[PDB]
Design a protein around this nucleic acid. Structure first.
Lengths: 282, 165, 170, 60
RNA sequence: CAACAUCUUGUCAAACUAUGAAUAAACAAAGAAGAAUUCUCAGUGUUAAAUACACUUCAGGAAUUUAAAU
RNA sequence: GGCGGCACAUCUGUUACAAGAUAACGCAGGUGUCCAAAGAUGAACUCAAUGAGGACAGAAACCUCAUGUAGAAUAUAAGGG
RNA sequence: AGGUAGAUUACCUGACGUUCCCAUCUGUGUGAACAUAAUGGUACUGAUCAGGCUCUAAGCAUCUUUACUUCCGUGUUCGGAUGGGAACGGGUGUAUCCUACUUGAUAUGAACCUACC
């Protein structure tokens, strides 16, 4: 009957596949080439990006500069290592994104050796107000660009929580404070969410509403014994314990082979056996 | 009788390569050009801004200046009975590194390796190695002997005509 | 530990569309009934191609709305109740969805004033499975596998299993 | 009185009688329109070197 | 019956094209003055800071080797 | 020569000969405009068409899923993107 | 073995079925606030009860496709050159260059920085 199938060989002979990552759905090659393009008169001077990618369970932040061979990672920091600094649950909070970003800033400056003159802010009362590192003596701060990727930039997005942590750590990231958790009200609106105030106001509300819902949403929090009054102080100490030891910490990897390719001899024999089966069958 | 448009006769010149439409590689904007390099001008019709004139397509030039977004290129242009010097400023999308000196730079490296070994040998007192021989056009090959134990003969004769229908 | 949990069917979208050929007055009320029935503002749909035969581009013709979750299942039963769970085998699409129609909306018949009037409605039910987001997510958007995607008889069996509705072949 | 419109006959023979005049080396070494910052560095050094060289001349 | 799909056959395009010659076009085959290496090395600027890098008679200065590169 | 036409300023494809240049009152056409948005930027989305479903509704109204390399659209002539 | 960022942009695509998930990734629960739309579907944010069902990745096939080799074929055409043959039309010989389509065999990715296993 009618098929008029538009998938015939004449269709493929002129098909033009997209770029592999764009074909995969991971990279926007129209904004990437704007974040990559170093000035041509600055020969081989790296251009750095904060690659902030949030999975379902971690906050991957990296510092990368691009080359023809590939992208090279100068530094990295994950939220899965926050338990070393005292945060065991809620690794993707707006509060845990600030720690991941701030840990990356202090890990980086320790590598370059500029961590003693570039300190940012440290007190907890200034977590809500805009801070951008400035010139110390006559040495500019480390400048970096925020690569967000395929993430919408709304007025609460965590990719700007990571950016706020980096600027608080003493690394210069050009920005505006119009997309943070604040951008409205004032510092304490921004400060509260940085300290987990939005998480430690839902445990209390849920506990008032229902016990099933409270144990369904915060099941592992109850087992860990984290009261809704301990989260705010937990992140205060985690911040204190990062500015004192950010420089990393601490075998055989078990492989699991999957199929391995069939050789020409095995592949050819499969046809011959099937051909022989067809002869006797028919 | 053509017209005098800036892009006349470019139905086939400015067409994208087959299955080569869309964006360009990132190595085009990541390759580093230095003053004195050899480049080839290749108009990219996908970028209509700053498109170089179609007469410079495929011309090999030298980089004479490097600006923040554009690369200066120096090419030769023929006029009535003389050659003039043309100085352009092209974005990296419309140019390409030239391999005109690919083999010359290889023979430069060979003579540098020999020269480096010669200074060490002169210090040691041992005789120095000679420089590599110059390239020559295909020379008359010398006389050679062929062992007939593994030689097979096939007679060659004109062939009887056979109809193609 | 069987993985049939991820293969359970569920109604993820129910679209109610009222198509009237006139803009104003009738369309104003046709939106009000859809708001009262569901609880959310509908969408005034404008014509795409003018047709003098039906006396219709820029004019607003129809109104539609989609409800999901617990509200979708409630309104579907009401639409099926008036249909008395009587669905033809032809009503099911080859992709795995189905739909039907309604001539009189039950709603509020008490104060049936000439202003509210009587409007007919059509129900279309879009089924799904847990894991269908892989085609709708913004990052790394993919195609659902052929086995995971529904079929005509998969929707029919779901209809006969959760609502005990028969399928007629007349 | 229609006349012949145009011909390229004998044009190439004329162009090669006195061959294609190549430019001199001085044409390839011009600097007008170079990078602004590159020219500023070059001017700063040439001014610095000239002042030092002149200072020795006045000294001796 | 058509009609629609699909598999072959016959013949074509200056204002059709995947592919694509021969002839050509424009480079390189060692001129800041015929190479190279070693040591020392300054002014600006890029830079997070640079001893990296860019330009400065391959800034400059001194030694040894060297006339070679179809 | 006159009548006719503009090959007189001018653009696209072809003649045209795989650099550049390039004839005929050679062929197929085009201009004397239009745009406060049809300029700039950011974000979201994907088009023409086809199949299968949904009361009136049918070949064509509106809704939904699937396939869909651009076969749509991009002010205009044609060619490029 | 897996994830992030990439470079080459089909050896990477498309169709049919297939294999694990132990970490990772995904799908997965929810709507209180930032934020979001007609719709918590998307985007946003909070979370961890379950699952390898689809993703993802690895593999299968006389698979369309694509990428190299041979053959097609020195056959088409072409640069140079007669007081060479023909009424033309057109087509030799000489010193040379040499395609393409199809078909057959092969392959279906290689490779760079960081973290974890």
């Amino acid at each position: 009957g009618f098929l008029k199938v538009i998938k015939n060989r004449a269709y493929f002979k002129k098909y033009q596949t997209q770029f592999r990552r764009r074909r995969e759905g991971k990279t926007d090659y129209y904004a990437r080439r704007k974040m990559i393009f170093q000035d041509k008169d600055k020969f081989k001077t790296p251009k750095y990006r904060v690659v902030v990618r949030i999975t379902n369970k971690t906050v991957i932040a990296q510092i990368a500069y691009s080359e023809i061979i590939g992208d090279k990672i100068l530094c990295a920091a994950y939220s899965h290592e926050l338990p070393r600094y005292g945060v065991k649950l809620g690794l993707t909070n707006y509060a845990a994104a600030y720690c991941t970003g701030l840990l990356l800033a202090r890990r980086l400056l320790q590598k370059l050796g500029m961590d003693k003159q570039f300190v940012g802010v440290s007190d907890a009362a200034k977590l809500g107000e805009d801070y951008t590192p400035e010139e110390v003596d006559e040495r500019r701060p480390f400048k970096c660009i925020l690569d967000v990727g395929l993430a919408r930039t709304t007025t609460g997005s965590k990719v700007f929580a990571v950016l706020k942590g980096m600027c608080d750590g003493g690394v210069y990231v050009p920005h505006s404070a119009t997309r943070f958790a604040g951008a409205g009200e004032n510092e304490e609106a921004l400060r509260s969410r940085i300290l987990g105030g939005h998480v430690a106001a839902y445990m209390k509300y849920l506990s008032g509403e229902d016990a099933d819902l409270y144990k369904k949403q915060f099941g592992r929090f109850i087992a860990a014994g984290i009261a809704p009054e301990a989260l705010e102080n937990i992140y205060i100490e985690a911040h204190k314990k990062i500015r004192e030891n950010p420089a990393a910490e601490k075998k055989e990897h078990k492989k699991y082979p999957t199929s391995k390719k069939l050789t020409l001899e095995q592949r050819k024999a499969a046809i011959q056996a099937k051909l022989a089966k067809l002869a006797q069958q028919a | 009788p053509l017209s005098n448009g800036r892009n006349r006769r470019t139905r086939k010149l400015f067409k994208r390569p087959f299955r080569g439409h869309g964006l360009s590689n990132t190595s085009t904007i990541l390759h580093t050009y230095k003053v004195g390099d050899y480049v080839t001008i290749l108009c990219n019709s996908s970028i209509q801004h700053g498109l170089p004139y179609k007469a410079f397509h495929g011309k090999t030039g030298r980089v004479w200046n490097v600006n923040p977004h554009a690369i200066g290129v120096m090419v030769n242009k023929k006029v009535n009975n003389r050659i003039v010097v043309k100085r352009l400023h092209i974005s990296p999308e419309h140019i390409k590194p030239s391999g005109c000196q690919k083999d010359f730079l290889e023979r430069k490296a060979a003579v540098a390796a020999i020269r480096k070994q010669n200074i060490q040998l002169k210090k040691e007192g041992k005789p120095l190695l000679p420089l590599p021989a110059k390239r020559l056009p295909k020379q008359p090959r010398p006389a050679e002997l062929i062992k007939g134990a593994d030689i097979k003969f096939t007679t060659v004769a004109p062939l009887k005509f056979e109809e193609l229908y | 530990c069987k993985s049939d949990v991820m293969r359970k069917i569920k109604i993820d979208k129910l679209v109610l569309n009222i198509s009237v050929g006139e803009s104003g007055d009738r369309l104003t009320r046709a939106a009000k009934v859809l708001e009262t029935l569901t609880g959310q503002t509908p969408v005034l749909s404008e014509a795409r191609y003018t047709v003098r035969a039906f006396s219709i581009r820029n004019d607003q013709i129809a109104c539609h709305v989609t409800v999901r979750g617990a509200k979708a299942a409630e309104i579907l039963e009401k639409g099926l109740k008036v249909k008395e769970f009587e669905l033809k085998a032809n009503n099911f699409s080859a992709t795995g969805n189905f739909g039907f129609g309604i001539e009189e909306h039950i709603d509020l018949g008490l104060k049936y004033d000439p202003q509210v009037g009587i409007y007919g409605m059509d129900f279309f039910v879009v089924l799904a499975r847990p894991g269908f987001r892989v085609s709708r997510r913004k990052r790394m958007q993919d195609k659902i596998g052929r086995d995971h995607l529904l079929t005509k008889e998969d929707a029919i069996n779901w209809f006969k299993e959760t609502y005990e509705g028969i399928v007629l072949n007349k | 009185s229609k006349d012949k419109n145009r011909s390229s006959h004998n044009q190439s023979h004329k162009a090669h009688r006195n061959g294609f005049y190549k430019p001199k080396k001085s044409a390839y070494m011009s600097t007008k329109g170079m990078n602004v910052q590159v020219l500023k560095n070059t001017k700063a050094q040439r001014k610095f070197a000239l002042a030092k060289k002149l200072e020795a001349k006045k000294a001796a």
